[model samples]
Target: GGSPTSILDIRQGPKEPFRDYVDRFYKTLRAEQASQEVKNWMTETLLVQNANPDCKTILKALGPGATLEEMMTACQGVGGPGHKARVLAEAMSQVTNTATIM
Candidate 1:
């Protein structure tokens, strides 16, 4: 365990999308051939503790051995450039509905 790398320095952006975070996560892990699974799990844990606090709470509610997709399902609704209000309204409709359902 004499390994020393910035790999441990990885931190998720406060508002980064889970997809993007995962992309970066895999890329960073790929940079190392030795600790892929461990690093991946470590990275996910750190993200849970740091990147998304709300996600941590949600995941805790989800309980042990939760799948990544399950965690992601709880992390829907982030925005991109010029993608703010659109995401918000999209978020609204996700919660609201066409109560017009007859």
Candidate 2:
């Protein structure tokens, strides 16, 4: 059977939970019988997807032959979409409060 479009369309969302995102892809991966290496690659790539643009420069500056691994590993320091969403929600809340006051 052909793979579902849902899985193909999956992306790290700015307001979506990280683990949930990983699990969605993980299930699809398991169905395809993917091994650990690809699994590792997928996780890293997914982490990179929702990351801030400055992260690229930060990883490049890390230097040396371990660049790719370092870049992916550094993604751990970054927050997921949920983090951004939380902040976004707060800003909107502030606007809502202001409207009530004014």
Candidate 3:
């Protein structure tokens, strides 16, 4: 009998307020000693996952010359309720997940 191939199950959670999730994620990352690539990937993933108001703020602040990587680094640890709400709205036009993700 051949061994079964394991399939990874990926699921998306309900959209959290950007600042809350980002702050929590940043804290978790800080606790671990990750390589530069891992760190960069983590940042990029978060930016991709939550690429809304926060990401936009970062890009706007940094201007159009900023790359996704640059925006991720610059926006790190820059989340709050107000910022989250604004970013979320800006990123999708609506605060609902249907609007943001779907």
Candidate 4:
């Protein structure tokens, strides 16, 4: 009918991770009636706006010209199942390294 809900309304709360936020954002964006071209252009802008503070910092580190994929990968490393998986992998690698050193 009227304008779809403001894209800014979809926010990543402090407790939410980028992966989860991004997933929800995608679903929300699809439900809106924006033109495909406009949606595509707005995707990264909305993502950066909606991201949690820590995730915003991560994106800042990426500097300008960072693609959506680059930002997503970096932010997903900040917190969540993905972060835990990386930690576990590192711990396991250290354990194996120590075992070899023994």
Candidate that scores best on TM-score: 4
| Candidates sorted by TM-score, best first | 4, 1, 2, 3
CA RMSD per model (angstroms): 8.3, 9.3, 9.3, 9.0
Model 1 weakest lDDT span, ten residues long? 75-84
Report the C-alpha lDDT of model 1 over 68-93, residue by residue, as the tens digit: 77766655333344235544575578
lDDT of 2 by residue, 1-102 (tens): 224633344454433333444456557656645468755665455434433443433345455345455654443333666445544676688788765653
Q: What local lDDT score does residue 92 receive in model 1, on the 0 to 100 scale?
A: 70
C-alpha TM-score for every candidate = 0.54, 0.37, 0.34, 0.65
Pairs of residues clashing in candidate 2: 14-81
Poorest stretch of ten by lDDT in candidate 2:
1-10
Full ranking by lDDT: 4, 1, 2, 3
Model 1 residue 92 CA deviation (Å) reads 16
**Candidate 1 vs candidate 4: which has greater lDDT?**
4
TM-score of 2: 0.37
Cα deviation in Å at residue 1, candidate 4? Answer: 16
Model 1 residue runs over 4 Å out of place are 1-5, 78-102
- Which is the better candidate, 1 or 3, if ranked by lDDT? 1
